[PDB]
Amino acid sequence: TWLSDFPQAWAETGGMGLAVRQAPLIIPLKATSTPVSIKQYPMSQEARLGIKPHIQRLLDQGILVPCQSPWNTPLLPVKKPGTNDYRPVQDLREVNKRVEDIHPTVPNPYNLLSGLPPSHQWYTVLDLKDAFFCLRLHPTSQPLFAFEWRDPEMGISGQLTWTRLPQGFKNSPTLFDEALHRDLADFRIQHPDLILLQYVDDLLLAATSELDCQQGTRALLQTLGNLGYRASAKKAQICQKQVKYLGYLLKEGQR
Template identity: 70%
Template sequence: MVDTGAQHSVLSKKLGPMSKKTSLVQGATGTRRYCWTTERKVNLGTHQVSHSFLVIPECPAPLLGRDLLTKVQIHFDPGGMSVMDGLGQSIHVLSLALRDEYRHFVPKPSEVIAPDVQPWFHKYPLAWAETAGMGLAKQRHLVVIELKAEAIPVRVRQYPMSQEARQGITPHIQRLMDAGILKQCQSPWNTPLLPVKKPGGTDYRPVQDLREVNKRVSDIHPTVPNPYTLLSSLLPEYTWYTVLDLKDAFFSLPLAAQSQEIFAFEWTEGEGQPVVQLTWTRLQQGFKNSPTLFNEALNEKQGIGKGVLTQQWGPWKWPVAYLSKRLDPVAAGWPPCLRIIAATAFLVCDADKLTYGQQLLVYTPHATEGILKQPPGK
């Protein structure tokens, strides 16, 4: 029944014998006379009461009126609403908003995989985040974060956090620690952790405020494609597309040890627990260069070197030529660090044909300079 504050409780259809008692009801469509039911037994959970209902067939839903609420012994006080039984004991009542009533009739989502998806699920088990877990790009070089020349460590105090929010993000922190993505550290850097409540639920997710870190890190020329440009290139005759959700994709790229300390933050599981510093061992979400670094790792094809020749035009780098070169069979079989050197050399040779031997600066996410300076025999 719907509690609308009505004076009398109403049924929308006859559920038993009717009495001769009638009443005039004033509504939006005029005044009409409606009948009452005989005294019916109403089960209140702990006891039964006798009650007569007004029957209005035009009423879209049964109404819970003040007359029946009085027999239920409902009370309102500054502490809230309470319902008492015949012995004066409180009864726990589940209140449901009318807009949520449909949830009683919605079938529970099945945990069984749909038949049309099962072949893909079994053929490619490592493609699903639920079964593959956190991935790690083992063939990728460690990501080194380059700081600005004038950058010094920054320490920002942790913001106050409610107990509910702390309990909400604790499972996520523990999951990341178990996966080795978070680890304890001692760092001169510190930035605050923010618990963000997920929309439509009670769960929280941890978000780190990296604004101060981003100010002190050197910028990388973005190579992430513009989504509007990509969408405009789709032909209108194509109506079906596949969308891949790369869940926690940044966590697949490992961070170099010397770059991990700049992402440190304070953490404690609650009052009375020690405060420790945690940091990330993988590429962090919220870091300004993460999309570019991940896109470069995603676009690298084995055996093919790719690059863009640009010319400085004011504050921008203007693209002049897009270069790609397939490595010869010998270079393609080298270890990844040597393949990078070979790909860089091939692209420099091709760019030299366009620059006529002018000064050329090479920007690469790979540690090519460190490889070239390695002592012989290492």
């Protein structure tokens, strides 16, 4: 019963995360960049109704806030089944083009897995839920990611923007990976024998025995919850001799 021993560490019982040790992120623009305001293609009522609940939840969570900004990018209505179940997808390409590039430090999965000794079996896989949203954005950088929002009848101001690292931003994966590495540096030091692989929001903890793995997992969960991150109890693979990680099936003294 891990879900009961670590309420704060699971997305299902700890609530939306927030990396309390990480200073709000400032996003540097290229030297010649100037704000770009792209028109919002009219959205059908169907798409708008499908997206609305997600927008309201984000507003309730403080992840989205009203704003007036010289920047504006289009929101897209993306479905999955056939025409049901929507979710907001922002096209941040014009913003991405104006943000200064950073070095891509996230290792490719092939290389990351090479750091797994055959001696370390007993794997634990955790995926952090709404990872990017756990990282706050400095108020000065928030206007950059604004988009327009119109509600059927009674509609909010006009524009809304993110107060957390957003989806669709070219540097989110890298900034998150680096931030979590900083937050988990001490854990690595306090658990010299454990193996910890990080691929943005996908974590793999490897141990020598089932005991060390259960001990390590308890410690990692406690630490993650403490720092403000949240793992998915639903998808969590705890102390298994076999697990799925980054598209691979780790089994028998390997990976």
